């Protein structure tokens with residue numbers, strides 16, 4: 001199919017239908033971005049030509065399609081009532097002259113299973129273009145990506161709605177961490193078979209579009225560092241120079257934090273510890289808050305907090321347990337300031353404490369914790 | 381031409397590249413061509429059967445090349461190279477049948493979106509197939525032997541359900557030299573070869589791949605060299621993904637060259653391969669998803685490093701990759717068969733239960749390495765000792781538990797040395813223990829708990845069981 005506005009459009013009942021080795025292309029992409037789709041689902045209001053459009057419960061199987069010069073390669077909407085109609089594309093060969101493109105898979109209220117074949121790209125707009133756009137996909141939907149990402153860097157995903165649904169199923173990412181961008185990390189639900197050892201943060205020169213798992217492309221904010229570390233099984237977080245700050249309670253992954261940066265909790269916020277393990281701050285320029293307790297522990301599992309940097313909770317505590325916890329805190333050298341090292345909201349929390357520094361509040365040596373904490377050992 | 385005109389290619393070896401099509405150096409005149417059941421036979425010795433060059437969007441169904449003349453292949457009416465294709469993006473070969481002598485089909489350069497479905501490619505018998513020298517191939521492929529399907533220079537043809545028979549090499553694929561572009565894609569290949577003669581099924585050079593196995597396959601008769609996969613110089617960023625079902629009979633999975641592992645087992649159904657097959661070279665496996673084994677077996681006397689090691693009847697021989705192997709298959713324990721399992725350089729031990737009659741020895745001043753949190757347990761072994769180095773070098777800041785219920789001898793060294801600001805709990809249960817200090821550290825304070833429950837211990841350190849860089853949380857001795 002050689003078309004001007006829309007290549008092929010599949011609507012309503014098409015059970016079991018198949019489209020094999022389709023070769024669908026606009027006759028060039030000149031002014032393609034100005035075409036207006038004629039037959040489309042109401043949820044699709046973007047301007048731009050669309051090679052393949054599907055909606056109202058249609059679930060045609062697209063096997064090895066070849067799509068060229070399109071603003072949108074695929075626009076698919078699940079059925080309005082229950083999100084029925086799986087978007088199925090196996091190994092699409094996507095290309096466009098000059099790299100002009102808006103999105104490859106614009107998915108509305110739907111699930112999908114796509115296998116990439118190492119061919120593709122994302123548009124020239126550094127803010128809006130992305131391989132995937134997930135619009136209002138429900139909580140129970142999953143948009144599964146298998147196969148090989150394109151060789152050149154692309155922006156993987158953007159979206160609207162409250163639920164993440166993108167799944168990297170053993171996806172071969174190539175050098176995307178180094179040369180590409182995730183786009184909006186919020187939309188990724190889970191990741192299988194893809195790891196990275198370190199997440200890089202740079203509050204001055206970082207970019208939130210980046211994956212953050214490669215040193216030359218660090219992200220900028222702390223907002224999603226726990227999620228990213230959980231997805232890629234990161235073992236460390238590297239803080240580039242400057243102050244990495246939070247203004248709302250934010251979770252910190254239980255990993256090793258390193259680098260010249262510092263951590264700061266503003267607006268009375270606290271850093272959150274929601275998982276067992278060991279949180280280590282090694283060699284940072286310091287961690288402090290402007291009034292909130294430093295670490296709010298919400299897990300009953302063994303939590304180890306290892307701070308080898310300057311620590312200043314001011315009048316507040318270093319650790320506050322919101323459950324009946326089990327905590328081991330060790331401060332190594334540098335300095336520490338707080339009213340109590342560990343406290344708890346209620347019915348007894350067990351804790352172990354080691355403070356190895358002359359620069360500490362000597363006054364609480366004999367009474368290091370509040371009444372709700374019972375010590376297993378105290379080494380000061 | 382030099383004068384600016386154009387001449388029809390009449391050269392047997394010529395094939396146009398994507399570059400040529402853009403340079404104006406080549407202009408294709410192959411379009412709107414459709415083939416249905418064309419049978420092509422050739423006199424013995426003819427070089428190429430079909431030159432499918434520049435045939436973008438051209439299609440084929442039931443194209444059949446070569447004649448099954450008789451048992452002797454040197455006199456059979458089939459060509460040395462069945463089909464050679466380039467600059468054919470969007471071309472589809474449906475149910476292509478090839479009887480060849482040297483090479484079945486060859487795909488080079490631009491072939492974007494091209495597909496070869498249900499191809500039936502076979503050498504006419506495998507007699508002297510290993511002596512066949514490939515004619516059109518990537519520079520990186522220097523091996524001798526017939527090749528059913530060859531692909532290089534960025535060609536990324538989709539191969540769906542091909543049936544490949546009697547080939548030395550079923551597939552030889554090389555990614556583009558500059559950026560490793562060109563995914564090797566094969567869905568459910570039905571590979572067979574009389575008398576199990578074969579060198580490799582997938583010889584992959586500087587490339588990524590996605591292969592789905594259908595429970596059909598085998599590896600050659602050579603116990604050292606033959607393997608299903610051979611990964612030659614695949615880049616760090618590449619992934620060679622294996623899905624589906626492994627062959628029923630044992631095979632050797634992988635061998636390679638290069639410094640980076642790229643093979644991925646994605647929920648692969650291994651059947652009884654741990655018991656009857658071999659991994660070959662564990663180094664090349666990058667990661668494993670959905671495949672677990674409870675125990676890793678080591679036998680310094682009767683073990684074979686080619687083995688998976690996860691089945692009792694097929695243990696591995698050395699300790700070099702036990703950490704790697706345990707991480708891949710989530711092993712809960714390691715069983716040491718009778719004999720001394722030794723290391724001559726720093727080697728990591730997974731945080732699992734070690735059991736069996738074997739012993740552990742660190743020679744040449746080496747140390748066992750603890751890089752992960754958890755509990756390392758040595759239960760009932762013949763003992764663990766070193767010839768001078770510290771026994772356990774801890775480099776993780778996570779909670780480390782060391783449970784020794786066997787004889788322990790670190791001589792003049794420590795049982796545990798924390799190279800970081802550690803958090804360790806050590807417990808010696810019965811047997812005997814010898815060391816200068818039970819736990820020590822290189823610098824800035826390490827917290828530790830210790831229990832030594834045995835009369836045969838260095839009694840002179842009951843009062844000072846650890847060095848000055850370690851602070852105790854509890855101490856249970858006597």
Ligand SMILES: OC[C@H]1O[C@@H](O)[C@H](O)[C@@H](O)[C@@H]1O
Pocket residue numbers: 201202205206215216217218240
């Ligand atoms: O773009 C930001 C990055 O630039 C790199 O050159 C530096 O090595 C990083 O420290 C920094 O985060």
Ligand SMILES: OC[C@H]1O[C@@H](O)[C@H](O)[C@@H](O)[C@@H]1O
Pocket residue numbers: 223224225226227228250251274
């Ligand atoms: O890192 C970001 C993540 O932080 C977690 O503590 C929240 O529970 C998640 O909703 C969020 O995605």
Ligand SMILES: OC[C@H]1O[C@@H](O)[C@H](O)[C@@H](O)[C@@H]1O
Pocket residue numbers: 700701702703704705727728751
């Ligand atoms: O067991 C083998 C593994 O041991 C680890 O300690 C090393 O970091 C890896 O390089 C190696 O593959």
